[PDB]
Ligand binder design. Structure first.
Ligand SMILES: CCc1[nH]c2nc(Sc3cncnc3)nc(N3C[C@@H]4[C@@H](N)[C@@H]4C3)c2c1Cl
Length: 193
């Protein structure tokens, strides 16, 4: 299964260089984009955390959390643990750690993985008034041996292009790294313009 992705990352992400490192972001962001396209997500945040980890926050419906009969597992777990808008499990496999929070029906559902492997069963950790999905991942330096350092300008350029191609979407990019903190927010107007 996912062990194949860890051993042949080149076949899954094209490159283990800086290009592959950035590709991980789009593999998550694309799913938030799909949920905006579905009509439910209005805003997406992409955050470069102070340790070069990545958080992606949307206000869509939230990844389905129900047990599926075919697997016996919550749908969200399968998303991240089974090889398949299908790259979520690839990002998981190539990260030292990934955590997902699903905000749905007044509850926050949480699960974490370590180099692709489940830590514990999906758990309600909190109550909430919001809806959406937050994915945070730390790219694996065993995989990304050239660089694990993100390029804010490169991410921002694409985020801007995505805002344009998905006219109406609010999407931001934030850098929380030491001595270079920055945030750019993009929104191209629809018929209200
Ligand atoms: C934060 C990134 C994100 N946001 C999402 N919102 C949603 S909301 C949703 C709710 N109900 C049905 N489909 C999507 N789903 C997701 N997935 C479900 C399945 C897509 N092929 C993978 C990832 C994601 C993902 Cl991954």
């Amino acid at each position: 299964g996912l062990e194949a992705v860890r051993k042949r990352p080149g076949m899954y992400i094209g490159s283990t260089s800086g290009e592959g490192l950035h590709h991980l972001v789009w593999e998550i962001v694309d799913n938030s984009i799909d949920e905006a396209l579905a009509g439910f997500a209005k805003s997406i945040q992409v955050i470069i955390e102070p340790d070069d980890s990545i958080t992606v926050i949307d206000d869509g419906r939230g990844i389905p959390v129900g047990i599926q009969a075919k697997t016996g597992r919550p749908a969200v777990e399968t998303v991240f643990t089974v090889l398949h808008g299908v790259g979520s499990s690839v990002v998981n496999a190539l990260s030292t750690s990934l955590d997902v929070r699903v905000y749905k029906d007044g509850k926050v559902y949480y699960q974490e993985y370590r180099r692709g492997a489940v830590v514990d069963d999906l758990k309600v950790i909190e109550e909430t008034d919001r809806h959406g999905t937050t994915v945070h991942f730390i790219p694996d330096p065993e995989i990304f041996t050239e660089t694990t350092v993100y390029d804010f300008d490169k991410l921002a350029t694409r985020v801007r292009e995505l805002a344009f191609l998905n006219r109406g979407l609010h999407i931001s990019i934030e850098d929380r790294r030491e001595g270079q903190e920055d945030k750019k927010e993009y929104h191209y107007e629809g018929l209200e313009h």
